[PDB]
Design a protein around this motif. Sequence first.
Motif, PDB file in Angstrom:
ATOM      1  N   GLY A 135      19.000 -30.779 -50.071  1.00 54.35           N
ATOM      2  CA  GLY A 135      18.674 -31.986 -50.848  1.00 54.35           C
ATOM      3  C   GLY A 135      19.219 -31.903 -52.268  1.00 54.35           C
ATOM      4  N   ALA A 136      19.185 -33.078 -52.908  1.00 57.43           N
ATOM      5  CA  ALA A 136      19.780 -33.334 -54.209  1.00 57.43           C
ATOM      6  C   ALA A 136      19.045 -32.546 -55.292  1.00 57.43           C
ATOM      7  N   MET A 137      17.781 -32.154 -55.032  1.00 53.99           N
ATOM      8  CA  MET A 137      16.992 -31.402 -55.999  1.00 53.99           C
ATOM      9  C   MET A 137      17.057 -29.884 -55.786  1.00 53.99           C
ATOM     10  N   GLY A 138      17.863 -29.420 -54.831  1.00 51.18           N
ATOM     11  CA  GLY A 138      17.866 -28.018 -54.475  1.00 51.18           C
ATOM     12  C   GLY A 138      18.305 -27.080 -55.607  1.00 51.18           C
ATOM     13  N   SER A 139      19.109 -27.591 -56.541  1.00 46.77           N
ATOM     14  CA  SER A 139      19.551 -26.752 -57.652  1.00 46.77           C
ATOM     15  C   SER A 139      18.620 -26.775 -58.863  1.00 46.77           C
ATOM     16  N   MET A 140      17.553 -27.576 -58.875  1.00 45.17           N
ATOM     17  CA  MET A 140      16.659 -27.634 -60.015  1.00 45.17           C
ATOM     18  C   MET A 140      15.457 -26.724 -59.819  1.00 45.17           C
ATOM     19  N   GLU A 141      15.025 -26.046 -60.867  1.00 46.92           N
ATOM     20  CA  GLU A 141      13.856 -25.197 -60.822  1.00 46.92           C
ATOM     21  C   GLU A 141      12.617 -25.991 -60.443  1.00 46.92           C
ATOM     22  N   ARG A 142      11.759 -25.353 -59.680  1.00 39.75           N
ATOM     23  CA  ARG A 142      10.485 -25.939 -59.332  1.00 39.75           C
ATOM     24  C   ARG A 142       9.747 -26.445 -60.568  1.00 39.75           C
ATOM     25  N   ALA A 143       9.656 -25.630 -61.633  1.00 36.34           N
ATOM     26  CA  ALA A 143       8.851 -26.032 -62.773  1.00 36.34           C
ATOM     27  C   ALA A 143       9.475 -27.268 -63.436  1.00 36.34           C
ATOM     28  N   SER A 144      10.797 -27.289 -63.502  1.00 34.76           N
ATOM     29  CA  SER A 144      11.558 -28.401 -64.078  1.00 34.76           C
ATOM     30  C   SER A 144      11.365 -29.704 -63.289  1.00 34.76           C
TER      31      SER A 144
ATOM     32  N   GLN B  53       7.874 -30.847 -64.238  1.00 31.87           N
ATOM     33  CA  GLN B  53       7.950 -31.405 -65.589  1.00 31.87           C
ATOM     34  C   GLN B  53       8.523 -32.822 -65.554  1.00 31.87           C
ATOM     35  N   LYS B  54       9.622 -32.943 -64.830  1.00 38.45           N
ATOM     36  CA  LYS B  54      10.277 -34.230 -64.774  1.00 38.45           C
ATOM     37  C   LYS B  54       9.480 -35.258 -63.985  1.00 38.45           C
ATOM     38  N   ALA B  55       8.716 -34.837 -62.977  1.00 38.69           N
ATOM     39  CA  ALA B  55       7.805 -35.753 -62.303  1.00 38.69           C
ATOM     40  C   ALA B  55       6.787 -36.324 -63.302  1.00 38.69           C
ATOM     41  N   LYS B  56       6.253 -35.483 -64.204  1.00 29.30           N
ATOM     42  CA  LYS B  56       5.304 -36.001 -65.199  1.00 29.30           C
ATOM     43  C   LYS B  56       5.975 -36.964 -66.179  1.00 29.30           C
ATOM     44  N   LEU B  57       7.215 -36.671 -66.587  1.00 31.58           N
ATOM     45  CA  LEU B  57       7.938 -37.588 -67.454  1.00 31.58           C
ATOM     46  C   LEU B  57       8.254 -38.915 -66.764  1.00 31.58           C
ATOM     47  N   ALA B  58       8.592 -38.840 -65.485  1.00 33.32           N
ATOM     48  CA  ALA B  58       8.887 -40.040 -64.726  1.00 33.32           C
ATOM     49  C   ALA B  58       7.624 -40.881 -64.626  1.00 33.32           C
ATOM     50  N   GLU B  59       6.472 -40.254 -64.369  1.00 35.38           N
ATOM     51  CA  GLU B  59       5.220 -41.000 -64.369  1.00 35.38           C
ATOM     52  C   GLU B  59       5.055 -41.768 -65.697  1.00 35.38           C
ATOM     53  N   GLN B  60       5.293 -41.100 -66.824  1.00 36.69           N
ATOM     54  CA  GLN B  60       5.076 -41.727 -68.133  1.00 36.69           C
ATOM     55  C   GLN B  60       6.008 -42.910 -68.327  1.00 36.69           C
ATOM     56  N   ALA B  61       7.195 -42.798 -67.746  1.00 38.52           N
ATOM     57  CA  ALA B  61       8.248 -43.797 -67.892  1.00 38.52           C
ATOM     58  C   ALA B  61       8.150 -44.891 -66.816  1.00 38.52           C
ATOM     59  N   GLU B  62       7.150 -44.779 -65.948  1.00 36.53           N
ATOM     60  CA  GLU B  62       6.950 -45.686 -64.817  1.00 36.53           C
ATOM     61  C   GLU B  62       8.171 -45.745 -63.903  1.00 36.53           C
ATOM     62  N   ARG B  63       8.763 -44.573 -63.693  1.00 39.88           N
ATOM     63  CA  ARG B  63       9.924 -44.389 -62.841  1.00 39.88           C
ATOM     64  C   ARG B  63       9.474 -43.693 -61.558  1.00 39.88           C
ATOM     65  N   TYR B  64       8.785 -44.445 -60.704  1.00 40.08           N
ATOM     66  CA  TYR B  64       8.093 -43.797 -59.599  1.00 40.08           C
ATOM     67  C   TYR B  64       9.054 -43.339 -58.503  1.00 40.08           C
ATOM     68  N   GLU B  65      10.162 -44.032 -58.269  1.00 40.51           N
ATOM     69  CA  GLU B  65      11.157 -43.547 -57.326  1.00 40.51           C
ATOM     70  C   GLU B  65      11.650 -42.176 -57.778  1.00 40.51           C
ATOM     71  N   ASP B  66      12.001 -42.041 -59.054  1.00 42.95           N
ATOM     72  CA  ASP B  66      12.420 -40.745 -59.570  1.00 42.95           C
ATOM     73  C   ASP B  66      11.270 -39.734 -59.408  1.00 42.95           C
ATOM     74  N   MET B  67      10.056 -40.151 -59.725  1.00 39.99           N
ATOM     75  CA  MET B  67       8.910 -39.253 -59.620  1.00 39.99           C
ATOM     76  C   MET B  67       8.796 -38.699 -58.202  1.00 39.99           C
ATOM     77  N   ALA B  68       8.917 -39.574 -57.221  1.00 43.93           N
ATOM     78  CA  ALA B  68       8.805 -39.159 -55.832  1.00 43.93           C
ATOM     79  C   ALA B  68       9.955 -38.219 -55.450  1.00 43.93           C
ATOM     80  N   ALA B  69      11.184 -38.491 -55.928  1.00 47.60           N
ATOM     81  CA  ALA B  69      12.291 -37.627 -55.596  1.00 47.60           C
ATOM     82  C   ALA B  69      12.080 -36.234 -56.202  1.00 47.60           C
ATOM     83  N   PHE B  70      11.556 -36.152 -57.425  1.00 51.92           N
ATOM     84  CA  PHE B  70      11.250 -34.874 -58.041  1.00 51.92           C
ATOM     85  C   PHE B  70      10.178 -34.148 -57.219  1.00 51.92           C
TER      86      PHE B  70
END
Lengths: 9, 9, 236, 234
Positions: free
Chosen positions: C1-10, C13-30
């Motif tokens: 998958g497209a997220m395979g190269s990103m660290e788990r913690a990252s 982190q980015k899921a929480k930022l996506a939540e704040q930004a109301e970017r739920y598709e991104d949140m789900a992909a993270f």
Amino acid sequence: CGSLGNIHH
Amino acid sequence: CGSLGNIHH
Amino acid sequence: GAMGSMERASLIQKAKLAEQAERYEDMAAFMKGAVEKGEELSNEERNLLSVAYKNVVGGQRAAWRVLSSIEQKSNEEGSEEKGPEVREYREKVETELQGVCDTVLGLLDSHLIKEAGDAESRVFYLKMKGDYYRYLAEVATGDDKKRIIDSARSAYQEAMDISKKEMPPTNPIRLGLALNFSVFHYEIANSPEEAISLAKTTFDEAMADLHTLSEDSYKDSTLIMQLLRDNLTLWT
Amino acid sequence: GAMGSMERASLIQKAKLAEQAERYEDMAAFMKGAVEKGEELSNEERNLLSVAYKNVVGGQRAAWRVLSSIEQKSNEGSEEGPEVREYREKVETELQGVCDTVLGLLDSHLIKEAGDAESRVFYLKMKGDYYRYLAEVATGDDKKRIIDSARSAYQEAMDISKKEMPPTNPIRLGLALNFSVFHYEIANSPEEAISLAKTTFDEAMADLHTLSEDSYKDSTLIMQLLRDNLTLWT
Ligand SMILES: *Cc1ccc(S(=O)(=O)N2CCNc3ccccc32)cc1
Ligand SMILES: *Cc1ccc(S(=O)(=O)N2CCNc3ccccc32)cc1
């Protein structure tokens, strides 16, 4: 009727 | 300030 | 998958930022990326997964219902023939919804449920499995529609059995499970009396255990109880 | 493109359905497909195009502002990794791509085929707006050129609108509103912003008497936003 996800927070 | 898009229809 | 190269913690982190930004598709992909790291999820991470996909599927269900209504209206008496476009578009949204449901069910089956031994995690995941089969059932019409309904019922029932054995009656996951299973009974299974009974018994057994709670636990339990009550008001 | 096999009229129908379903990404893809059929757009179709992309880019801009603000806070007694910047960049790149897509439609070939004032002003206003959104996130060697690109498009629109449209025309009013916002928020020219909004409001007020009730409602709606901006700016 509402489900759980509908509740705010 | 608002731009045009902000106006409801 | 497209997220395979990103660290788990990252990814978290980015899921929480996506939540704040109301970017739920991104949140789900993270969060999907985070699940696919293969580690079990913490309480907070399970909630992030659920919020992300609830928002994605919620927009899709809202769209599907709008389109379905237009489609139904077009098939009335006296209605002008408008061509295949409404059905095609409803089908497009339906297929996309089904794909998100299949994705969440696949995360649960590979391998979140099997590794979930604590009651809190196992119940959470089985509730989610019930919910995403329920969303599938909302749009189902085929040879397999009874099996989709039964799949939601089986998952909810297994969650209910564990929750009653292992969790207090005010636990918010137990409460939200019972809430959602009552909605399944009312909306999906054509069982309004089972819905009403379940919501009432849940409410009453929660009420009797509130005395045990801290102020902060009380606030969460009573918030879900209020939605049980409001559904009961509507249903009766 | 993915909409090449669908009828123009079916794309417009589905754009309207998408709007009703609040599926604005789909709406925009349908309207892009319609534009790419190569025919000119009607008034209603131009409005569908604008509504679709406004919603898409508006979500992105709101996201970008959230993330930029977090990023700005991080960079200051602030605890330190790259995730906030990377994610803001991801949303920025997506936003820029949507703006480039809209500008591309305008340049290939909507503006050149638009001869009536209504259509030509509509599309030049759009061109101003999408360069303005590019300007909002711009920080490179070309940032002044992006600003000048928005200014030039808005100026050409303004010049046509003054010659060919009444001062209450809603496109003319929306243009002036958006150019005033450009001056205030992008060009560091609050006094130009205030002057433009005031003159636009006053010239519109004086023309209201010529309008039907329905036209009056549209014109006054935009005038109210000019006034509310002026109230904030002064
Ligand atoms: C299904 C479910 C039920 C409760 C929870 S929670 O973590 O207790 N929580 C967050 C989600 N919504 C909510 C509403 C009211 C009270 C608590 C919560 C998560 C998932
Ligand atoms: C830029 C612009 C200005 C006006 C219009 S419109 O079609 O006249 N119209 C009426 C007033 N406000 C509005 C908001 C959103 C969409 C259309 C309108 C179109 C474009």
